[PDB]
């Protein structure tokens, strides 16, 4: 296998992280396990400290005219890498044990355990004119050297190896999304059934979505157009809970349903980024600068847990709405993310 | 007494600071951010001050009369109100931007666009011209007082005299309204900043530094501009009651804000490094082979 080894500007610190992307199981998040190769002769007085900080960048500026930092550490853990502390001792994994053998005694292992119910690696799409670091949650194992944690972290000794906490699709398929909204107009005084539904709940990125819109308009009023919008709701709860909506795919069909008539159409849509790159504030998946960033994967939150979680929590729902001579609307939620890569 | 050195000092300060800020924002691609272009219009507005306004103003003050030109007197005056109104509105715009960022950072990303910010400063320059140039072209600011009419008729005389209506209208639309928006926006920013620091709580030192930064940028602006528009409000009610030498002294205290804006609003490390360079890394992620089991 291979191990990603990012080195510090000076070159003394080199963190050997086995993988830059860690599968996110809602039941038990995987550990960020690695070893830091340092020279025992160098920094004889200081102590190598590694920290896995989940910095949520809400502003695209490291510093501004006011001096306020525009990055909040939602989850920051500090473990003493060298010298090994008896209290911080952890059972070395197969990856860590193999790395220490290859590197030798000069290398010291470090392990982390990301608590569950945390935001995944999501990046707010910066516009084409935007200049600066992309916003969103990003995990990074900053390996620095300092006598204490509160001491200024010199960038020459730091190792900012940004990683991504990606969440793939579950092995079990979800229930068929189904939602029906009936609106009764005062003048018409008759129901307007909109029994739209999806073929499946788990959709792979780039896979077409088939919305079986089944309209049964019994009211005298007729629908002029059928607008299906795949609204991406980013539940950002950093300071104040706010659901930011961004349409990633809109289909406005000029299909009219005469009064006292039924309708049934399977609209095929596909959430893609090629057209949504102009959209500002869109939540994209958190990937490395080299790898291409796709649409943010739907965060699978723990059932029966806190509804508010700091960071970006994207949720996709197709909004099948019919405009009438007010308008009817119904939201069918669905989870959009990649499947677990098969390994053997 | 000599006015060349006293006037040259401030002149060199404004032109030097602004040229340095403009050069740092242009040459350096990292500084070409969204919040920086707001300061580029402030520095651009402050540059025209030290280039055309401050030099002509200093001469008229110590010489005693305006001998450059008859129409140039009104042109220089209109350009002065334009730059001041633009500088004040720019300080209020960036303040609103910091509020939109600190309070609603996620909405500020999509709401505040580079092209939109360019339109914002363009509208700022437009409203300032409507308050400065439009009255000058129509001579609406000219007062009907006897001393005022005498000064206007005399080509040499160029004292800034305005009627009660225009004086109040300009004072409320140019300084007081942006002032109320600025003080209110900064108060909300300070409250929200403390809440963010409390939620997060090296940590307290940065908080105190940010809180101190906010205070100095607001105190320097107030202490410089408030006295000028404060005495002007009384001068409008009683022109003869207020003195001319004090009106000029406070007007220069207001120009000091534009003179200190480049060094006060660019104190961030990104701007300090660019200034040091004008006055004069991240290692790629590799990989190694792990012995297979």
């Amino acid at each position, epitope marked *: 296998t291979r191990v990603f080894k990012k080195a510090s500007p000076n070159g003394k610190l080199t963190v050997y992280l086995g993988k830059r992307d860690f599968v996110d199981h809602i039941d038990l998040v995987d550990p960020v396990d690695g070893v830091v190769l340092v020279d025992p002769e160098y920094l004889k007085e200081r102590r190598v400290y590694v920290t896995l900080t989940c910095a949520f960048r809400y502003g695209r500026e490291d510093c501004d005219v006011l001096g306020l930092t525009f990055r909040k550490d939602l989850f920051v853990a500090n473990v003493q890498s060298f010298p090994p502390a008896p209290e911080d001792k952890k059972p070395l994994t197969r990856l860590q044990e193999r790395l220490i053998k290859k590197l030798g005694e000069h290398a010291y292992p470090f392990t982390f355990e990301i608590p569950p119910n945390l935001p995944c690696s999501v990046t707010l799409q910066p516009g084409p004119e935007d200049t600066g670091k992309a916003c969103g949650v990003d995990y990074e194992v900053k390996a620095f050297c300092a006598e204490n944690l509160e001491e200024k972290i010199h960038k020459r000794n730091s190792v900012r190896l940004v990683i991504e906490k990606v969440q793939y699709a579950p092995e079990r398929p979800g229930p068929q999304p189904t939602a029906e909204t009936t609106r009764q107009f005062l003048m018409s005084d008759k129901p307007l059934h909109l029994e739209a539904s999806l073929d499946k709940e788990i959709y*792979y990125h780039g896979e077409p979505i088939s919305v079986n819109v089944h309209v049964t308009n019994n009211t005298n009023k007729t629908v002029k157009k059928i607008k299906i919008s795949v609204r991406q709701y980013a539940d950002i709860c950093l300071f104040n809970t706010a659901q930011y909506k961004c349409p990633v795919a809109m289909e406005e069909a000029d299909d009219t349903v005469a009064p006292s008539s039924t309708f049934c159409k399977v609209y095929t849509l596909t959430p893609f980024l*090629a057209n949504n790159r102009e959209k500002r504030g869109l939540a994209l998946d958190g990937k490395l600068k080299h790898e291409d960033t*796709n649409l943010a994967s739907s965060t699978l939150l723990r059932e029966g847990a806190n509804r508010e979680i700091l960071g970006i929590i994207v949720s996709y729902k197709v909004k099948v709405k019919l405009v009438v001579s007010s308008d009817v609307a119904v939201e069918l939620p669905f989870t959009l993310m990649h499947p677990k890569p098969k390994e053997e | 007494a000599g006015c060349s050195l006293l006037m040259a000092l401030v002149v060199l300060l404004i032109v030097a600071g602004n040229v340095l800020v403009i050069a740092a924002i242009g040459r350096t691609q990292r500084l070409q951010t969204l919040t920086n272009l707001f300061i580029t219009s402030l520095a651009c507005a402050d540059l025209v001050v030290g280039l055309l306004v401050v030099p002509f103003g200093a001469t008229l003050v110590c010489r005693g009369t305006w001998l450059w030109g008859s129409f140039l007197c009104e042109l220089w005056t209109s350009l002065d109100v334009l730059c001041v109104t633009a500088s004040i509105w720019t300080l209020c715009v960036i303040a609103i931007d910091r509020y939109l960022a600190i309070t609603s950072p996620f909405r500020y990303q999509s709401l505040m666009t580079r092209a939109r910010a360019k339109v914002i400063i363009c509208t700022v320059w437009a409203i300032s011209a409507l308050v400065s140039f439009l009255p000058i072209m129509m001579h609406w600011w000219r007062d009907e007082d006897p001393q005022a009419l005498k000064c206007y008729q005399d080509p040499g005389c160029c004292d800034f005299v305005t009627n009660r209506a225009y004086a109040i209208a300009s004072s409320i639309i140019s300084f007081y309204i942006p002032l109320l928006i600025m003080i209110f926006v900064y108060l909300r920013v300070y409250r929200e900043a403390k809440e963010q620091i409390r939620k997060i709580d090296v940590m307290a030192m940065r908080e105190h530094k940010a809180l101190k930064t906010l205070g100095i940028i607001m105190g320097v602006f107030t202490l410089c501009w408030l006295p000028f528009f404060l005495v002007n409000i009384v001068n409008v009610f009683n022109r003869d009651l207020v003195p001319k030498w004090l009106f000029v002294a406070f007007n220069w205290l207001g120009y000091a804000n534009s003179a200190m804006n480049p060094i006060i609003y660019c104190r961030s490390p990104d701007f300090r490094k660019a200034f040091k360079r004008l006055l004069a890394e991240s290692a790629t992620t*590799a990989s190694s082979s792990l012995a297979k089991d």
Partner: antibody, heavy 119, light 109 residues
Framework: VQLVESGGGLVQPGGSLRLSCAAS????????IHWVRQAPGKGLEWVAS????????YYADSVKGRFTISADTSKNTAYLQMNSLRAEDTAVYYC?????????????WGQGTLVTVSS | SDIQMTQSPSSLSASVGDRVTITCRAS??????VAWYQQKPGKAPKLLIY???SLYSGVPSRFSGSRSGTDFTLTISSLQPEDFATYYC?????????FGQGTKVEIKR
């Protein structure tokens, strides 16, 4: 699961052609369509690729400019418009697919369409 | 620049039920993203191994991939009569992807 390409015929140098590639069993957004030409008695040479999910049009250094790759989403078809043809382009063009999330070789390959280029 | 993939041997001779090895060296330090394809005369190529270490679903298990830094290797434990075809190595890590020169494998007599 099946890629069928067509539109490859005899063309003279400097002519124009439109090579089509229809897909069946997979959409153009979830997988990027790639074009690789293999000249007779020579190895494979990547021509150009289209990523509908990203709208990225990648071309080879020697093939960039003269070629124009596009994709029709409604018909899940790929198109490779060819202009300023040269004798070197004589090869068996193959239309394959690559997993957009994420790139893992080229799973399915087309039968190929011999497009000879000679005066 | 273009990362040309030097593949060898240009022509490998082997017999049925024998072990063969095809080497492919990248000009630059390419990552594990190096696929291996099988091209038969006339027929279209076939993706044998992806990521240089993961066999594509539906291919025989005899094929195997092993990375030794920059010299990727495709090994066949026991090649059958159907395994007599050309082999190519492409580096889909950096664009433009560059294929290999080819390694024609024929029956040894």
């Amino acid at each position: 699961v099946q890629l069928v390409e067509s539109g490859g015929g005899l063309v003279q140098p400097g002519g124009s052609l439109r090579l089509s590639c229809a897909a069946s069993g997979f959409n153009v957004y979830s997988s990027s369509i790639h074009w690789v030409r293999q000249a007779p008695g020579k190895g494979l040479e990547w021509v150009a690729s289209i990523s509908s999910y990203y709208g990225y049009t990648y071309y080879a250094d020697s093939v960039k400019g003269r070629f124009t790759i596009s994709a029709d989403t409604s018909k899940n078809t790929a198109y490779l418009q060819m202009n300023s043809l040269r004798a070197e382009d004589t090869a068996v063009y193959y239309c394959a697919r690559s997993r957009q999330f994420w790139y893992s070789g080229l799973d399915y390959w087309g039968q190929g369409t011999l497009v000879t280029v000679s005066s | 620049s273009d990362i040309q993939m030097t593949q060898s041997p240009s022509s490998l001779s082997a017999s049925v039920g024998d072990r063969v090895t095809i080497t492919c060296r990248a000009s630059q330090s390419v990552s594990s993203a190096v696929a291996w394809y099988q091209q038969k005369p006339g027929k279209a190529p076939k993706l044998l191994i992806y990521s240089a270490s993961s066999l594509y679903s539906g291919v025989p298990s005899r094929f195997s991939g092993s990375r030794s830094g920059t010299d990727f290797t495709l090994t066949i434990s026991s090649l059958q009569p159907e395994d007599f075809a050309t082999y190519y190595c492409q580096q889909y890590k950096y664009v433009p992807v560059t294929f290999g020169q080819g390694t024609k494998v024929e029956i040894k007599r």
